[PDB]
Amino acid sequence: ARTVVLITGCSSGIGLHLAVRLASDPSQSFKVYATLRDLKTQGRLWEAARALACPPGSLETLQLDVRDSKSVAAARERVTEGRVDVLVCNAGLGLLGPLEALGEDAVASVLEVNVVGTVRMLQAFLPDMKRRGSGRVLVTGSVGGLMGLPFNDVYCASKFALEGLCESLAVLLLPFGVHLSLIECGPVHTAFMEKVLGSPEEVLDRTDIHTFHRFYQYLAHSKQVFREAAQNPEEVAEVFLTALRAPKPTLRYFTTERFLPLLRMRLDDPSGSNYVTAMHREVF
Amino acid sequence: ARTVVLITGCSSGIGLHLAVRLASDPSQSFKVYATLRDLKTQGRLWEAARALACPPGSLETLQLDVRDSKSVAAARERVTEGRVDVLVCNAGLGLLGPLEALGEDAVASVLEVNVVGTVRMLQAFLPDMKRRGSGRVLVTGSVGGLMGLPFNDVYCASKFALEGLCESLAVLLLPFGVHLSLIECGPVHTAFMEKVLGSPEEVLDRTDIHTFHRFYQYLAHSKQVFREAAQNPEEVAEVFLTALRAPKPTLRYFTTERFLPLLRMRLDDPSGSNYVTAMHREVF
Numbered sequence: 373a374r375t376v377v378l379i380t381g382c383s384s385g386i387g388l389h390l391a392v393r394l395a396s397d398p399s400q401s402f403k404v405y406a407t408l409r410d411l412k413t414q415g416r417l418w419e420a421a422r423a424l425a426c427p428p429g430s431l432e433t434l435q436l437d438v439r440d441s442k443s444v445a446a447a448r449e450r451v452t453e454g455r456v457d458v459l460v461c462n463a464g465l466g467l468l469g470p471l472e473a474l475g476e477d478a479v480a481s482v483l484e485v486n487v488v489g490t491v492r493m494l495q496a497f498l499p500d501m502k503r504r505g506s507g508r509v510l511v512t513g514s515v516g517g518l519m520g521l522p523f524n525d526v527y528c529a530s531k532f533a534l535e536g537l538c539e540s541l542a543v544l545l546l547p548f549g550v551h552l553s554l555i556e557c558g559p560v561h562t563a564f565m566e567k568v569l570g571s572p573e574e575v576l577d578r579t580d581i582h583t584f585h586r587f588y589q590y591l592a593h594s595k596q597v598f599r600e601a602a603q604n605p606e607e608v609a610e611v612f613l614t615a616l617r618a619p620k621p622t623l624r625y626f627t628t629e630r631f632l633p634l635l636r637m638r639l640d641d642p643s644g645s646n647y648v649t650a651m652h653r654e655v656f
Numbered sequence: 657a658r659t660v661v662l663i664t665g666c667s668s669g670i671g672l673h674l675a676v677r678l679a680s681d682p683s684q685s686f687k688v689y690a691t692l693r694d695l696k697t698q699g700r701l702w703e704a705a706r707a708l709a710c711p712p713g714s715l716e717t718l719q720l721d722v723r724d725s726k727s728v729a730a731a732r733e734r735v736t737e738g739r740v741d742v743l744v745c746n747a748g749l750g751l752l753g754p755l756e757a758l759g760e761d762a763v764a765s766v767l768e769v770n771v772v773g774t775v776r777m778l779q780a781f782l783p784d785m786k787r788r789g790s791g792r793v794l795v796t797g798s799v800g801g802l803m804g805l806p807f808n809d810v811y812c813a814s815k816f817a818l819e820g821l822c823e824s825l826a827v828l829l830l831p832f833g834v835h836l837s838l839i840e841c842g843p844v845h846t847a848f849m850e851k852v853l854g855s856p857e858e859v860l861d862r863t864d865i866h867t868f869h870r871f872y873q874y875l876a877h878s879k880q881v882f883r884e885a886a887q888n889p890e891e892v893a894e895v896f897l898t899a900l901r902a903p904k905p906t907l908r909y910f911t912t913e914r915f916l917p918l919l920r921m922r923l924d925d926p927s928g929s930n931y932v933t934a935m936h937r938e939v940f
């Protein structure tokens with residue numbers, strides 16, 4: 373009962389943090405369906421849930437594989453309330469390394485999960501929301517979906533894709549009463565994030581010494597930005613709640629304002645020259 | 657010999673028009689490899705080539721299926737000059753209709769062709785260009801890759817994806833001497849384009865009467881813009897040549913300036929509200 377919320381990718385990151393934040397809310401007004409690709413990773417969620425003493429029945433875990441429309445439909449049947457008021461499309465994958473070093477299947481997976489996965493969720497849940505004339509969909513964005521970043525080619529491709537998919541739907545949904553918002557996250561404190569970055573030899577034999585040397589420089593710079601600007605998951609997760617509660621929500625919510633100046637010079641020059649130059653000088 | 661150019665998707669559209677435009681150039685300085693997914697569609701290309709009296713040996717057709725890395729590699733071996741100076745990533749698919757009415761495989765194909773296909777081409781051809789310290793890659797963009805359009809959700813997703821993939825690479829390639837440019841096309845006179853649009857019943861039984869009614873309104877509006885603003889393929893194809901010849905090319909080349917005001921109000925308001933409102937009022 374209550375405001376039924378369904379979130380994808382709750383085994384860590386803002387997803388897990390958002391589920392427990394909702395389920396543990398003092399008002400006890402949200403019933404939460406935290407979905408995970410592999411249930412064997414539900415431990416963290418439950419330990420975090422017990423840590424915030426979430427009332428029994430405010431949090432339920434479902435196995436949902438966004439790469440499978442059959443998994444998406446089945447999970448939709450498990451929603452006992454037979455209604456979803458807030459859908460949070462959060463599941464996502466990252467990809468780092470020179471374009472030529474990335475395996476084809478890896479590239480195919482990031483699009484499949486990040487973009488198509490979100491398409492599968494919306495196809496399954498959008499119809500009913502339009503029929504009711506109400507619903508809210510929140511999508512986890514990234515400033516990497518607002519500007520291109522070296523060595524994150526395919527990652528930015530998928531995030532830029534969400535921006536376009538969402539802006540299009542938004543124009544159409546305006547009259548149907550269903551709201552759609554993107555939460556533009558900058559870097560969020562994920563120790564695992566700063567540890568995933570770092571690939572010597574394996575990358576070296578699949579690229580050239582000059583691209584490799586550039587990858588190193590990018591990694592060094594990346595570590596700096598993360599350290600000096602990574603936000604608390606609690607700060608980010610709360611933005612999801614600000615959007616979620618806004619009577620007339622905007623299409624975009626920015627969790628931080630530090631990256632806004634770099635985005636402005638990106639439009640003052642539609643030819644992309646200024647940006648490409650500024651970003652290169654700053655990263656190299 | 658000469659400036660070797662390889663283009664994808666030459667069975668019609670700007671691709672075909674660009675190949676013959678290059679191969680027939682008075683200076684006879686371009687050797688052209690026009691690739692097609694199905695060779696049985698090479699007729700038009702050849703008839704157009706004969707119409708512009710292209711010298712023998714200035715145009716060669718190769719079957720290249722961008723959805724297959726095996727096809728991409730094989731075609732790369734057919735390049736007798738053993739070098740590619742200008743790669744034009746043009747192959748692409750469109751998709752129209754309410755998100756919920758689009759089949760999953762159709763959505764998967766547009767990303768596979770438009771985005772991954774471009775990834776497969778760059779992985780195969782980027783390395784060599786970096787090793788030489790020179791090369792030019794031109795990618796066919798769309799203003800639908802710069803702003804979201806109702807009923808073109810997945811199409812805009814794929815075009816927004818190219819924008820992100822390219823802006824990222826650009827930042828990295830700046831020092832390697834290889835140039836990458838996007839050609840932002842508005843609508844181009846394609847009779848087939850205005851005839852593809854239009855789907856009653858089939859769409860109706862896979863959506864609701866209100867979305868259907870909106871689809872109709874969008875189609876009506878789409879027909880107007882095309883009629884009042886579609887450009888000649890010769891005008892667009894020439895932009896590809898302006899980029900191709902620029903000593904220091906920019907990241908973006910716009911074939912028309914009419915859509916620039918609508919793009920400006922899109923950044924003056926990063927929350928996306930103004931744009932979503934303006935585009936809805938204009939389209940509905």
Ligand SMILES: C[C@]12CC[C@@H]3c4ccc(O)cc4CC[C@H]3[C@@H]1CC[C@@H]2O
Pocket residue numbers: 514515516517521557558559560593594597631654
């Ligand atoms: C795209 C992200 C936000 C923007 C970050 C940024 C922003 C600007 C910059 O100069 C470098 C970086 C490196 C890490 C990036 C992040 C990686 C994941 C995160 O979502």
Ligand SMILES: C[C@]12CC[C@@H]3c4ccc(O)cc4CC[C@H]3[C@@H]1CC[C@@H]2O
Pocket residue numbers: 798799800801805841842843844877878881915938
């Ligand atoms: C995205 C395209 C350019 C922009 C066009 C536009 C631009 C603005 C607008 O008000 C409506 C349309 C409808 C058709 C669109 C086109 C469909 C294909 C073309 O590339």
